[PDB]
Design a protein around this ligand. Structure first.
Ligand SMILES: [Zn+2]
Lengths: 213, 389
């Protein structure tokens, strides 16, 4: 949820610094990316040692992010690169989060979903298990499943990676998030587009040359 | 029925458009109940006139405009488009980038020529009783998904007038779907990957999504009669090689013999199942699907501004009327007994009026359209009167 640009003001030093700090964090998402794998805590804790150390902190991550937009909103390689690491980071931020607080961001969000009781769960377990990916096994595990409007699951059902029944998609909580993430990539991309759009009214400024280069 | 003479079209159309076109019902539908600003007034119609001139951003104020105008222009073709931000005909009046397609029923179009590689009966633009079963299977496979999967309740299936059918999903919620979603609905229903001339076109994975399964089932219920008896897909070497092609080469020669020692397709098919079963220990289902599963054109359904053939319009060549198909008796639907504009004009001749169409062979068809309409009214009355509470 990196919307609403920071209206605060900061020294050219704050700016100048932050940028480099982030260019590092994402640069680190570049390191922890090809040197490891999502190998639990190794890839995790290592990433979360950079996290706090490098600063981000919430209000810091906020500003940091936006300032870097001015940076990578030019070359597509950047926009793809920036949106890239920026995502792996947002996932990480979820991973850790506990079941309690996770549920809040879901609700507090707008997505209208529900959790199904073992009632409908076993009844549809059969279908659900068949809709899924190559997801080996025939057990609908213990991970609860939700009932959300079929449209909201667009990226899932268009590839028959989920069960539709009566205009509803029945997905695991692993998938609801996966949806929210693509929604992120998308919304963000719309933003980098708009920034680049009005970048010109900022090219000329000298304080911003280190950054844009 | 008597072979239709397209030369009489100009006169027939005039009659047809002044005494038989179900105007009031056409209006009742497109106006959806006055529950919206200018939902009708902002609906775009397209026409194909005289020398095949093509007018397009046509619009109308009320049902009376629609009648007056149509009768004056006696359209050879009438197409329905989206509901716009401004009356279509005043697009010269609207700014640039302000005029936009906002709402429109989800539509599908199924054409027999999209199966020319899986039929031995007729030639491309034609159809006979031996290939029409495909339209039967298409309507059932697609209408089941739209109803059971997506929860769409209002689906108007219509005969194209020559060799195919159209489906108009009208759920108030559906008329608001984004192209991205429509494009997705189509991908969800699509299964035959008709590549640049690639023999095999269907591949199942160990796992089978329920939509595919329920589809296979429906097909199963017509495969033998349609494929084995009517199409006789395994009648010759020139025919079964075609099916052998969709099977792992390590099995060709064996079956090639069984086929050779058989007398009919129902037999050979049974060998194919047997042999393929050993090997497997899905090859079967894939073949049925590649021969019977619908081929949908993503373009027709993706665009929210797409102009599609209007129900009750007249087909220039076949003369047949684009009539609503009755789902409760789909299998019974017969393309060849579908009233001709000529045929119905004659019935009328051999006889205000306002119930003229009822004395014609259109009667049953307009009846179907009315039930379709009665249900719209319900859902509407249901939702509002009971949910605005
Ligand atoms: Zn045929």
């Amino acid at each position: 949820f990196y919307l609403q640009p920071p209206s605060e003001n900061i020294s050219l030093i704050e700016f100048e610094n932050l940028a480099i700090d982030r260019v590092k964090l994402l640069k680190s998402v570049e390191n922890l990316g090809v040197s490891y794998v999502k190998g639990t805590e190794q890839y995790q804790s290592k990433l979360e040692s950079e996290l706090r150390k490098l600063k981000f902190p919430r209000r810091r991550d906020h500003i940091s992010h936006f300032i870097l937009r001015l940076a990578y909103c030019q070359s597509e390689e950047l926009r793809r690169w920036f949106i890239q690491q920026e995502m792996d980071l947002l996932r990480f931020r979820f991973s850790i989060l506990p079941k309690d607080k996770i549920q809040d961001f879901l609700k507090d969000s707008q997505l209208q979903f529900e959790a199904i009781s073992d009632e409908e769960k076993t009844l549809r377990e059969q279908e659900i298990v068949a809709s899924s990916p190559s997801l080996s096994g025939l057990k609908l595990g213990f991970e609860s499943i939700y009932k959300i409007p079929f449209a909201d699951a667009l990226d899932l059902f268009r590839g028959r990676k989920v069960y539709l029944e009566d205009g509803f998609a029945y997905v695991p909580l692993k998938d609801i998030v996966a949806i929210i993430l693509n929604e992120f990539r998308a919304k963000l991309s719309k933003a980098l587009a708009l920034t680049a759009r009005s970048l010109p009214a900022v090219q000329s400024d000298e304080r911003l040359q280190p950054l844009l280069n | 029925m008597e072979t239709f003479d397209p030369t009489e079209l100009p006169e027939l159309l005039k009659l047809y458009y002044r005494r038989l076109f179900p105007y009031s019902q056409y209006y009742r539908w497109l106006n959806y109940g006055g529950v919206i600003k200018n939902y009708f007034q902002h609906r775009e119609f397209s026409f194909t006139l005289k020398d095949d001139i093509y007018i397009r951003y046509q619009s109308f104020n009320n049902q009376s405009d629609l009648e007056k105008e149509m009768q004056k222009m006696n359209p050879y073709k009438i197409d329905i488009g989206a509901v716009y931000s401004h009356r279509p005909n005043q697009h010269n009046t609207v700014k640039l980038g302000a005029f936009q397609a906002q709402e429109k029923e989800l539509v599908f179009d199924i054409d027999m020529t999209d199966y020319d590689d899986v039929r031995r009966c007729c030639s491309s633009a034609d159809i006979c009783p031996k290939c029409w079963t495909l339209m039967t299977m298409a309507i059932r496979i697609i209408d089941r998904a739209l109803k059971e999967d997506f929860g769409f309740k209002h689906r108007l299936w219509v005969y194209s007038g020559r060799r195919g059918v159209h489906c108009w999903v009208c759920d108030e919620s559906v008329r608001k779907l984004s192209s991205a979603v429509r494009s997705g609905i189509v991908e969800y229903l699509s299964l035959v990957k008709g590549g640049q001339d690639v023999k095999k076109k269907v591949h199942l994975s160990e796992k089978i999504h329920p939509f595919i399964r329920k589809s296979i089932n429906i097909i199963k219920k017509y495969f033998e009669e349609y494929a084995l008896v009517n199409q006789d897909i395994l009648e010759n070497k020139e025919s079964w090689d075609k099916i052998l092609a969709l099977v792992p080469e390590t099995i060709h020669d064996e079956l090639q013999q069984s086929f050779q020692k058989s007398h009919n397709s129902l037999q050979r098919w049974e060998h194919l199942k047997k042999v393929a079963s050993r090997y497997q220990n899905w090859l079967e289902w894939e073949i049925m699907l590649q021969y019977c599963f619908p081929r949908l054109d993503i373009n027709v359904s993706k665009g929210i501004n797409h102009l599609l053939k209007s129900p009750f319009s007249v087909h220039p060549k076949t003369g047949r009327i684009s009539v609503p198909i009755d789902l409760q008796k789909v299998d019974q639907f017969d393309p060849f007994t579908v009233p001709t504009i000529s045929f119905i004009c004659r019935e009328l001749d051999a006889i205000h009026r306002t119930r003229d169409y009822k004395k014609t062979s259109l009667a049953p068809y307009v009846k179907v359209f009315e039930h379709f309409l009665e249900n719209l009214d319900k859902s509407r009355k249901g939702e509002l009167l009971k949910k605005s509470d």
